[PDB]
Amino acid sequence: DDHLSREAVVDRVLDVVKSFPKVDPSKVTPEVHFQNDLGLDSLDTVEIVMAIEEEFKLEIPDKEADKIDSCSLAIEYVYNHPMS
Amino acid sequence: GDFRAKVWSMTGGPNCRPKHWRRNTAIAMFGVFLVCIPIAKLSAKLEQRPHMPVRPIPSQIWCKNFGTKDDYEKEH
Amino acid sequence: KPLSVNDELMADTVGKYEALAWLSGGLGFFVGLGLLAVLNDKASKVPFTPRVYPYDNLRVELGGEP
Amino acid sequence: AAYFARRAAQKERVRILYRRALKDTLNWAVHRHIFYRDASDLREKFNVNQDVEDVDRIDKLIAHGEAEYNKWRHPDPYIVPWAPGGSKFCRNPTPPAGIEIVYNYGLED
Amino acid sequence: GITYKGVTVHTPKTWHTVTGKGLCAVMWFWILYRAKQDGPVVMGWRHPWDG
Amino acid sequence: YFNLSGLILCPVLGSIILLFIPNSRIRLIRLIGLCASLITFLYSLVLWIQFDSSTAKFQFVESLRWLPYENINFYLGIDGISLFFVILTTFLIPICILVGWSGMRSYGKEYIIAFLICEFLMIAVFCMLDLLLFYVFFESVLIPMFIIIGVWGSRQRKIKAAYQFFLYTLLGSLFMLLAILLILFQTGTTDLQILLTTEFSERRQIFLWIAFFASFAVKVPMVPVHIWLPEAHVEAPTAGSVILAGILLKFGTYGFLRFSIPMFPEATLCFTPFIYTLSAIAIIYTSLTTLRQIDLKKIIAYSSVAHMNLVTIGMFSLNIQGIGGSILLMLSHGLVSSALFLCVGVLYDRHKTRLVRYYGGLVSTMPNFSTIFFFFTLANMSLPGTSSFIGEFLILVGAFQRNSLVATLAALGMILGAAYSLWLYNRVVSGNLKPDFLHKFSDLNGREVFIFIPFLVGLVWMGVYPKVFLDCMHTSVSNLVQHGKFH
Amino acid sequence: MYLLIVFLPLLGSSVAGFFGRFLGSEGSAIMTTTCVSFSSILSLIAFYEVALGASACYLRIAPWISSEMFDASWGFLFDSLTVVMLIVVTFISSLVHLYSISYMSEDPHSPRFMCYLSIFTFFMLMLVTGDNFLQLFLGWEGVGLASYLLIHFWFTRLQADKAAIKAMLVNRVGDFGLALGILGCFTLFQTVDFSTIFACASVPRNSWIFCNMRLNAISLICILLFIGAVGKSAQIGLHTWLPDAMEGPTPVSALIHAATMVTAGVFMIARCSPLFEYSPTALIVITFAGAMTSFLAATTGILQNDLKRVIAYSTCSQLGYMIFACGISNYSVSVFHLMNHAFFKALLFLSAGSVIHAMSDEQDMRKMGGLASSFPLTYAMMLIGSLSLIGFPFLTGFYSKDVILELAYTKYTISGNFAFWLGSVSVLFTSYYSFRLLFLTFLVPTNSFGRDISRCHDAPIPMAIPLILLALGSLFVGYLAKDMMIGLGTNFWANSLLVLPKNEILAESEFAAPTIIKLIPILFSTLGAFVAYNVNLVADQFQRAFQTSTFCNRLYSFFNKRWFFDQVLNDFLVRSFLRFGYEVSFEALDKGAIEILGPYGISYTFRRLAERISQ
Amino acid sequence: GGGMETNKNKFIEDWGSARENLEHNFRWTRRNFALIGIFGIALPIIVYKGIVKDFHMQDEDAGRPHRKFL
Ligand SMILES: CCCCCCCCCCCCCCCCCC(=O)O[C@@H](COC(=O)CCCCCCCCCCCCCCC)COP(=O)(O)OCC[N+](C)(C)C
Ligand SMILES: CCCCCCCCCCCC(=O)SCCNC(=O)CCNC(=O)[C@H](O)C(C)(C)COP(=O)(O)O
């Protein structure tokens, strides 16, 4: 009944992004850019955002779902949301 | 919230829990019991049973209108 | 943003007429099944004669003339 | 401006279409064991069309993709219960702030 | 409570499992016991005493 | 010995005493007005007690000469039909006085004086047994109501609404007065008991009946003339609407019961399909137009037209279920509708608005009001255990016996009546709050809680045991059912 | 002792709603639960005394409406039929009250919920124990008011308010039909009392003039009453309110819509049987409507994914079964199936609510799976309920549904064949979606989220005692009451139900038909279970057909969207009436047309006329 | 903000005023003429014929001649 701390969110989000086949889990900092630090396809960013969505059981409205292009933004969005 | 604690409602409001709900609960039973006595006494008086029961039923302890309307030809 | 004059009353994959056609087909299924039941004529295939009661089909006990 | 906006806007419409198609595909295939191949094929639909570079032919492809998705979409999608349009939405909402209640409103003199 | 990968599943208390198993066993035994008594009747193999 | 003289003189003394009191003494004016209204109400209640319910003759008759040859004179008397109307019109006045209790410092003595003159004029209307003087007090109500609408109106529209109401009432009144004059010249007198024993030639029944219908149908708005009621009703103070809907809408039906259904038994039968046609479409049209209204007081005002047109179906059925059950509906309507306008008046006094859009979520800030508002919502939608259902159902069984089709059409009235009645409650009470529009709230005070109490008690008492009211009328309504009949 | 049965829920509601601020969330629960439980035990003595002792009691308090002959007094009639409804309604109400103590443990406004439940129980008791047609109507409309109040118990939601208002509109059309029927009853017999009407229900053989038509007096009254029964029981004509009414709390679904207030129509038909028996034309309509409702609900409920909505269509199908069982003029079997269903459907709703509450209010079957090990008790309970519902042999649902089907077979008439066919196919469909609900929620590989599984807790004691009692009921009560209700020549009903000697086919239902007919429901249930298993547990998931076939997608939409009733009916009736309210009645009839010929539209020419007087 | 009076909105207030000032909004088009001549001139006639014929058929069933409802 208590919202999890930020570092607890960091653990789960970094685990989600680490558990991806195309990425290289050698260096995955919380401050990374999907299309600039990991070098991925444009589409697989959508898959990672989705997998984050069901992993925390929250529905991101489609408008700013694609705005999440960095691990930093994803953590902030899944933290400032109260119902998560 | 902060303002719903300043609103008086008969039901009690959200998450109502008075300090003495145990004592109030006991009183409410006794009040319901006291008002149920005249209803039971009234019911045992105005009730009619045209048919005698097959076996001795508990309602024969208080009710007395058993087999009374058998002469329906003189009803009003 | 002035409000609309009818601002007091406010299945997306179908239209009203297309869905009405679908409903009409669904109810025509029932109508056709009823017509088939009529065509079967189960009344003439009853395996027993109508039940006959004593004392002239219980005329007195059913409110008939004594 | 077209090289930065008229082309990049489609690069966002395609992301939106991919998201909606993936959610719909998960909705249709109830079991997780079956969703994997369906999603793989769904991305293979997009991954084969990456060879295009001229706007003269991509735009109608996006229009056709939206038309296709709009008719194979699930009639009853899945919504999180507390999300808008869900079942638990607005069940016991937090009361709005700034609302105050006054006492002794109507009192003579 | 057993954790496989982060997620944990709280083991149900003994009272719930015992009650569920008992009710299911009672249902099965009752079904078989009824099938023993009037099972032939519904199959049409034998009337109760009609014939 | 309580007679009709004292009941009528009490408002006279109340209005005279305040007439010569300095306006600086605001407290004394309110106390004396309220005391006079309460004394009149108790006088009416006592008059109920000593009311014989076995004779069709008019009771507590009083006479006062008007013309030198006693041709026309002040004949005051009550029967089983107009007794409850007198009780209601004396009971509603103290509530109206209590409505403007807080803001009375601005109205002054001319407010209570106007309401007491109103009570004086309405008591005599239900008690007059003379056709001409019934017209004199019938149209004497305009001046106090004209003053109430104009002087203490809400916006500048009060000039238009007062003009429209006054013009409609005048055009009905004089066309009725010509018929009254023709009756006086032919018969010789205007006494009701004499006019009920005089045979009218069949040709004169239609003309006189039409002329009487012209004035009465305006005050019981049928179809062509319910356009003055909404405007004049919305442009009225909170207590002003209670008088207009509580009593002023009961003149037309009472006029039909007293001077039309008996003086022309043959004409009434011929025009029965005409009344059924007008009332059936009025129930359908008005209960449907109510759905697309946005003003709080313009929705309930449209809930009265459907209810009052359901009454005229009952009266013209000419049986005990119909005529007898139509009286209970007006007593129920006089309490349910006037209580709803109190609920709207509660909302308007705090938040100076009436649009339903601004209101919502009051269930979380005004719970006592929501409980009281919901109860009168149930009564307005004809729920059993309420006084409206008894009248509504008795009218239906009284019209089905005469015409099954008109009882079917009138039965859709409760279908539509239950539609907007609950849909309004959902908008106003249930839902989420809107702090952008309005944010300060206050539930019912001591006055509002106490004011609604007699309405709550008097609505279920008539709804679960209407035998108290019914048994006082059957001797009087049965003699009304047959007048020309002798078999 | 019999007035206490009716008025204990009223007193409990009047205490918990007027003085709930002093009792809190616990005292308000205790008052209502204790009052309803005492009413339940009093109903148990009432069953031991009236139904088993064969001595009915008639109790009149005071006259309510006294016109010249429109007498509808405050009378209570306890006969064999009434007592069965008492021991069903009050027992289910007490169990739901006990269930809601733990269900509404975190909701803020628990006392008002219990007050609403108690007032609903009081209205249902007034309905069942009604001596007149008006007290019956009083309960018949109070039950609708209580359901409306309970459906939007969460007033903040918008869907709840829409569902509640739709339910009120449908019940209002039903009430209009019932009111017309009651008006017809008084016009013939000049009474509304049940005893006089049922005594004089055979003599009248005249014809009326109804709405420019010459019809039969009894047939018209029976049809009008059946209109009201359709309105309340969610039959073919008016049923869309029931699936939408699931927006309320789960205990509201379990009591308000499963056991009671949907069986109100069946109870009214069964009670008015001494009147419906003399209008053979109405029985055909009843049979057709029941068969259509059963088949339509069975077809609609096979593709729903919401856990609560699937069960609502099961309730609709069972009510259709009861309706055309009444249509074969066999009311004993109808009441037997009513009492049977009020056990294994209340159990189903309670177990589904126990699953939903523990799953963080997750209602979609696509997002639950593998809950059998986690929820042992509730899985077993839903297994028992589903097996009873499908009609597993030698179980509560087997002693009534099979009898109804074989009775429909032996009704050798045009109407009977249609009902038999639809009720036979509905068995297969019912088995299919019941087993799909069981499979998806409990036995398929897990499809839920990590958070829902982590926060799991089985039903505590207050939510388990009513479950266990309902399980024992759904196990044994059907067998126990099989002999007394649907036996041969049984006198349990006494004069409660009348079946004319001509239309009595109960004896031939047992030994006049091939044994294959008595085994059709079991074979169809097995086929449906096999189909559900082969489409859910193990399958290649050929859903690609739903993504490549245009007809398949539209066919899937047809069953999912309630046969396109809500969409079509809205656009063609509700929207049309909303336009009929403004665009004509308000826009043209009374807007300016009266004004232009009135006092100021053109009558203001006096300004252009008085000013000319200077000439 | 120490006032209970509503913060009225220009859009809502203007919309309500327009919806209440509809008296002066006729153009006397064919739609209004047809609408008032059908749903205000024909439906009352149909209903009146319905009640009159219902009375006539009630009269003929009892054998009594028709009543002159004029
Ligand atoms: C008239 C014949 C039929 C009678 C049917 C009665 C059915 C109940 C009718 C009234 C129900 C109340 C609905 C209107 C009020 C809506 C809810 C409300 O606000 O009421 C208050 C007051 O509580 C009540 O609802 C009291 C009314 C119901 C209890 C009294 C009923 C007594 C028994 C019914 C009548 C007895 C005879 C019935 C048979 C003729 C409860 O507030 P809370 O639950 O605490 O939550 C609100 C949030 N906040 C606190 C912040 C404001
Ligand atoms: C319910 C129905 C389910 C869905 C059914 C299928 C719906 C869609 C069917 C049609 C799909 C298509 O082929 S059309 C969608 C894609 N069409 C193309 O032509 C891709 C060309 N590439 C690009 O646009 C960019 O490179 C970009 C992709 C942004 C990568 O960003 P980067 O520049 O960084 O690499």
SS (H, E, C) F93-146: HHHHHHHCCCCHHHHCHHHHHHHHHHHHHHHHHHHECEHHHHHHHHCCCHHHHH
Q: In this structure, what token pair is assigned to residue F217?
A: 């149908």
Tell me the ligand closest to D71's alpha carbon.
2
G479 contacts chain E (CB < 8 A)? yes
B8 sits in the region (left: phi over 0; alpha: psi -120 to 50; else beta) called beta
C-alpha–C-alpha distance, residues G59 and G74, integer Å: 9
Please report, as a single letter, which amino acid is at residue F171. L
C-alpha–C-alpha distance, residues G240 and G260, integer Å: 17
Please report, as a single letter, which amino acid is at residue D32. R
Residue H44, class by beta-carbon neighbours within 10 Å (0-12 exposed, 13-18 middle, 19+ buried)?
middle
Residues with CB under 6 A from ligand 2: A 42; D 11, 14, 17, 21, 24, 42, 45-46, 49-50, 52, 58, 61-62, 65, 68-69, 72-73
Give F221 Cα–ligand 2 centroid separation in angstroms.
67
What is the least distance, in Å, from the CA of H39 to any CA of chain F? 10
Q: Do G211 and H54 touch (CB under 8 A)?
A: yes
Which residue's CA is the nearest one to ligand 1's atom 23?
B11
CA nearest to F106 within chain D? D109
User: How is residue F75 annotated by DSSP?
Assistant: E
Half-sphere exposure of F441 (CA within 13 A, CB side): 29
CA G39, distance to chain mean position in Å, is 22
Residue (of G107, G257, G230) closest to G171 by Cα position: G230
Q: In this structure, what token pair is assigned to residue G568?
A: 């079509």
Q: Of A40, A42, A44, A46, which is best to mutate to test ligand 2, by the most ligand atoms within 8 angstroms of its C-beta?
A: A42
Please, are residues B8 and F365 in contact by the beta-carbon 8 Å criterion?
A: no
Chain G residues with CB under 8 Å of C43 CB are: 412-414
Counts for chain F of helices (H) and strands (E), in that order: 23, 3
Residue D9, class by beta-carbon neighbours within 10 Å (0-12 exposed, 13-18 middle, 19+ buried)?
exposed
C-alpha–C-alpha distance, residues F354 and H33, integer Å: 33
Q: What is the DSSP string of G370-412?
A: --TTT-HHHHHHHHHHHHHHHT-SSSTTHHHHHHHHHHHHH--
What helix, strand, coil percent values describe chain G, rounded to 5? Answer: 70, 5, 25
Please report, as a single letter, which amino acid is at residue C52. V
Rounded to the nearest 5 degrees, what angle is found at the Cα of F103, between the Cα atoms of F100 and F109?
A: 70
Please, are residues F392 and F310 in contact by the beta-carbon 8 Å criterion?
A: yes
Where are the alpha helices (H) located in G104-205, listed in sequence order?
110-128, 133-151, 158-189, 194-199
Q: In this structure, what token pair is assigned to residue C53?
A: 């009661």
Q: Do G107 and D92 touch (CB under 8 A)?
A: yes
Chosen from F362, F364, F372 to mutate, greatest number of chain B CBs within 10 A:
F364
CB B5 less than 6 A from any atom of ligand 1? no
C-alpha–C-alpha distance, residues H10 and G607, integer Å: 35
State the method: cryo-EM
Which residue's CA is the nearest one to ligand 2's atom 18?
D49
Residue A52, class by beta-carbon neighbours within 10 Å (0-12 exposed, 13-18 middle, 19+ buried)?
buried
Q: Could you count the other beta carbons within 10 Å of the beta carbon of residue G102?
A: 18
What is the least distance, in Å, from the CA of F214 to any CA of chain D? 44
Chain G residues with CB under 8 Å of H64 CB are: none
Determine which helix (DSSP H) or strand (DSSP E) holds G95, and give its type and residue range: helix G80-103
Chosen from H32, H48, H66 to mutate, greatest number of chain G CBs within 10 A:
H32
Strand partners, D100: F440
Give D74 Cα–ligand 2 centroid separation in angstroms.
20
Give G265 Cα–ligand 2 centroid separation in angstroms.
57
Please, are residues F283 and F309 in contact by the beta-carbon 8 Å criterion?
A: yes
C-alpha–C-alpha distance, residues G613 and G422, integer Å: 84
Which of A24, A41, A44, A69 is an active site residue? A41
C-alpha–C-alpha distance, residues F306 and G520, integer Å: 56
CA F266 to each of CA F215, F258, G454, H56: distance values in angstroms, whole numbers, following the listed order: 20, 15, 84, 18
C-alpha–C-alpha distance, residues G100 and G117, integer Å: 10
Q: Which residues have C-beta within 8 Å of that of residue G480, sequence separation ≥ 6?
A: none
Give the position of tokens 């083991």: E11
Rg (CA), chain B: 23
Q: Of G8, G64, G112, which is best to mutate to test ligand 1, by the most ligand atoms within 8 angstroms of its C-beta?
A: G112
F404 contacts chain H (CB < 8 A)? yes
Helix axes F320-350, F387-400, angle to 10 degrees: 140
SS (H, E, C) G34-91: HHHHHHHHHHHHHHHHHHCCCCCEEEECCCCEECCCCEECCEEEECHHHHHHHHHHHH
Q: Which residues have C-beta within 8 Å of that of residue B55, sequence separation ≥ 6?
A: G53
C-alpha–C-alpha distance, residues C39 and C45, integer Å: 12
Q: Do G20 and B12 touch (CB under 8 A)?
A: yes
Please report, as a single letter, which amino acid is at residue G334. S
Q: In this structure, what token pair is assigned to residue F112?
A: 């209570």
CA F134 to each of CA E25, F76, F129, G491: distance values in angstroms, whole numbers, following the listed order: 86, 10, 7, 67
Rounded to the nearest 5 degrees, what angle is found at the Cα of F355, between the Cα atoms of F351 and F360?
A: 70
Please, are residues G345 and G259 in contact by the beta-carbon 8 Å criterion?
A: yes
Q: In this structure, what token pair is assigned to residue D105?
A: 């409103």
β-strands D100-101, F440-441 pairing: parallel
Annotation marks residue A41 as catalytic: yes
C-alpha–C-alpha distance, residues G350 and G112, integer Å: 20
Q: Could you count the other beta carbons within 10 Å of the beta carbon of residue G187?
A: 16
Please, are residues F215 and F172 in contact by the beta-carbon 8 Å criterion?
A: yes
User: How is residue G448 annotated by DSSP?
Assistant: S
Q: Which residues have C-beta within 8 Å of that of residue G431, sequence separation ≥ 6?
A: G390, G524, G525, G526, G527, G528, G529, G532
Q: Do F367 and B8 touch (CB under 8 A)?
A: yes
β-strands G75-78, G57-60 pairing: antiparallel
Give G136 Cα–ligand 2 centroid separation in angstroms.
65
Q: Do E24 and G380 touch (CB under 8 A)?
A: yes
Phi, psi at residue F51, to the nearest 5°?
-90, 115
Resolution (A): 3.4
β-strands E8-9, E2-3 pairing: antiparallel
B1 contacts chain D (CB < 8 A)? yes
C-alpha–C-alpha distance, residues F116 and F37, integer Å: 8
Please, are residues D78 and D29 in contact by the beta-carbon 8 Å criterion?
A: no
- Which sign, positive or negative, has the C-alpha torsion G400, G406, G408, G410? negative
Nearest CB partner across the interface for G560, out of D72, D76, D81? D76
Q: Of D13, D14, D20, which is best to mutate to test ligand 2, by the most ligand atoms within 8 angstroms of its C-beta?
A: D14
Nearest CB partner across the interface for F364, out of B4, B10, B11? B4
Please, are residues G86 and G9 in contact by the beta-carbon 8 Å criterion?
A: no
Residue (of F139, F172, F8) closest to F77 by Cα position: F8
Counts for chain C of helices (H) and strands (E), in that order: 2, 0
Q: What residue segments make up the domains of chain A, in order of their start?
A: 8-84
Determine which helix (DSSP H) or strand (DSSP E) holds F455, and give its type and residue range: helix F446-464
C-alpha–C-alpha distance, residues G241 and G170, integer Å: 7
Q: Which residues have C-beta within 8 Å of that of residue D54, sequence separation ≥ 6?
A: none
Q: Do G377 and E30 touch (CB under 8 A)?
A: no
Q: Which residues have C-beta within 8 Å of that of residue D67, sequence separation ≥ 6?
A: none
What is the least distance, in Å, from the CA of G473 to any CA of chain F? 35
Please, are residues A12 and G451 in contact by the beta-carbon 8 Å criterion?
A: no
Please report, as a single letter, which amino acid is at residue F305. V
Residue C13, class by beta-carbon neighbours within 10 Å (0-12 exposed, 13-18 middle, 19+ buried)?
middle
Give the position of tokens 């029981």: G233
Tell me the ligand closest to D70's alpha carbon.
2
Give F210 Cα–ligand 2 centroid separation in angstroms.
79
F26-35 long-range contacts, CB within 8 A, separation 24+: F26/F104, F26/F105, F29/F104, F29/F108, F29/F109, F29/F112, F30/F97, F30/F101, F30/F104, F30/F112, F33/F97, F33/F112, F33/F115, F33/F116, F34/F94, F34/F97, F34/F98
- Which sign, positive or negative, has the C-alpha torsion G17, G18, G24, G29? negative
User: How is residue B66 annotated by DSSP?
Assistant: B
Residue (of G500, G325, G347) closest to G416 by Cα position: G325
Q: Do chains A and C meet with 3 or more Cβ pairs nearer than 8 Å?
A: no
D8-17 long-range contacts, CB within 8 A, separation 24+: D10/D55, D10/D58, D10/D59, D10/D62, D11/A42, D12/A66, D13/D62, D14/A42, D14/A43, D14/D46, D14/D62, D15/A42, D15/A43, D15/A45, D15/A46, D15/A66, D16/A62, D16/A66, D17/D62, D17/D65, D17/D66, D17/D69
What is the least distance, in Å, from the CA of B6 to any CA of chain G? 13
Determine which helix (DSSP H) or strand (DSSP E) holds F62, and give its type and residue range: strand F59-65
CB G109 less than 6 A from any atom of ligand 1? yes
A54 contacts chain G (CB < 8 A)? yes
Strand partners, G364: G306
